[PDB]
Amino acid sequence: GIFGAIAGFIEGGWTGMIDGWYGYHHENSQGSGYAADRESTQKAIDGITNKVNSIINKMNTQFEAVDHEFSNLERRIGNLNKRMEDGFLDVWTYNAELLVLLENERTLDLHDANVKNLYEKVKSQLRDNANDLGNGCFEFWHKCDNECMESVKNGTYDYPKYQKESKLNRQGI
């Protein structure tokens, strides 16, 4: 997709993550789970809701066609009315259909970007204390606690704290 994450280097989504659009999956000696990142999810919900409402608001005008009759001496003005009314119909049908195609493209890209930025947020915290498997997964070189997992998620990961354990594990391999 344009940021390359969704249906990209993260090949699939998670039916097991039901509480958010974007999330973390973890496994550790204490268990495993799928959990949404609430801030990025809620921000995205607020934006998309706003996009939908803005479009609805912008579209809330109506062009009104009319029931008027015209005589056998009014072919010109009768046709003028028909061309006028068909004209606005074609303009608005165009405006709505194109807007939908364009905004659907850009909405999917916004989701892709939010996933991508989440992934980069973790990768810059972990540095060489973890190994990039593919598919947006990292394997820690150290034991990573539930508390450690929460620290990666809320951006408080203490790299130095695990640097020695990590290096020792890294090259033992």
């Binding site: 090949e11 989504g13 039916t15 659009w21 000696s29 029931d67 049908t93 999917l108 190994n131 947006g136």
Partner: protein, 325 residues
């Protein structure tokens, strides 16, 4: 070792959107913006019923064709429904002049109030009681006339004198009224009904003048009539006065309408039912919260925007890529 992975939501949705780049994309969440569904009936708008003209056209109603008596009084309406196969219109053949403007003026109203504008006594020394024709039966009388007009004829013995009438609109509402000019087929019918000599119909107000005289000739038979009536309408503004003067061939105004006051005239066969609506189209009621609709550009009330589209579905969710089980 321990894993942390980053990812996104999937679900069992099979609903698709299109994109400039890609068609048929399954997404986890989305909103359809277009309404394609309608109740095929007419309902009240603003808790106000529409006027069903039934077997009468607008002409038959407002001129008062004798067969249109069901519609005779005051009427208040939210819109008008005219049935396409309505057979009672102009019964005595002729042209209702500026017909299209009359239909638009009537469509812009919401109420009329019928009242006697010119009592028959207004016109002295003529006969106001013989003005009927087999072209205009009621359902019970084989020869009648418009309820809103008087077909004046000369008295049995006397010549047709100059008749005159005035009506002063001292009210606050415009008055819609009607008159006509008889064009006999023959100079014989002409002399029988009216005097010998040149005849005229003249009318005026502060802002309007009318003058017309009979165009005597035989036209193709319509409801057995080779003669014709030219019908006319006008609107007497509040404060205005109408003067009427004629020495023959006048089809006089009798009853008129105080006229009050978007309006619509729907030509349709749909039934009017005991129901309410906020959006009424010519092909049905929309009961919806959608932004667009493909039902009809012709409506009354508050409707969504008409477009030719089949669907306008907006992705709100992400692309749906659930695990293959």
């Amino acid at each position: 070792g321990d894993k942390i992975c980053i990812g996104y939501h999937a679900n069992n949705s099979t609903t698709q959107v299109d994109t400039l780049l890609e068609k048929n994309v399954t997404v986890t969440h989305s909103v359809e913006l277009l309404e394609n569904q309608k109740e095929k009936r007419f309902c009240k708008i603003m808790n106000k019923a529409p006027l069903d003209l039934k077997d009468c056209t607008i002409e038959g109603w407002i001129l008062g064709n004798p067969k249109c008596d069901l519609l005779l009084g005051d009427q208040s309406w939210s819109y008008i429904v005219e049935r396409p196969n309505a057979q009672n219109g102009i019964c005595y053949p002729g042209v209702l002049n500026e017909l299209e403007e009359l239909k638009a003026f009537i469509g812009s109203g919401e109420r009329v109030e019928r009242f006697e504008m010119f009592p028959k006594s207004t016109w002295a020394g003529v006969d106001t009681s013989r003005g009927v024709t087999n072209a205009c039966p009621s359902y019970t009388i084989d020869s009648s006339f418009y309820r809103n007009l008087v077909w004046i004829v000369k008295t049995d013995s006397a010549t047709y004198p100059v008749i005159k009438g005035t009506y002063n609109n001292t009210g606050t509402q415009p008055i819609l009224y009607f008159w006509g000019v008889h064009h006999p087929l023959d100079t014989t019918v002409q002399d029988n009904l009216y005097g010998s000599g040149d005849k005229y119909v003249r009318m005026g107000t502060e802002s309007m003048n009318f003058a017309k005289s009979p165009e005597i000739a035989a036209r193709p038979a319509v409801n057995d009539q080779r003669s014709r009536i030219d019908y006319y309408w006008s609107v007497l503004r509040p404060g205005e006065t109408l003067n009427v003067e004629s020495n023959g061939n006048l089809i006089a105004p009798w009853y008129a309408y105080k006229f009050v006051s978007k309006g619509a005239v729907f030509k349709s066969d749909l039934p009017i039912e005991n129901c309410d609506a906020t959006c009424q189209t010519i092909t049905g009621v929309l009961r919806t919260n959608k932004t667009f609709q493909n039902v009809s550009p012709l409506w009354i009330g508050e409707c969504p925007k008409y477009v030719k589209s089949e669907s306008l579905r907006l992705a709100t969710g992400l692309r749906n890529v659930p695990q293959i089980a």
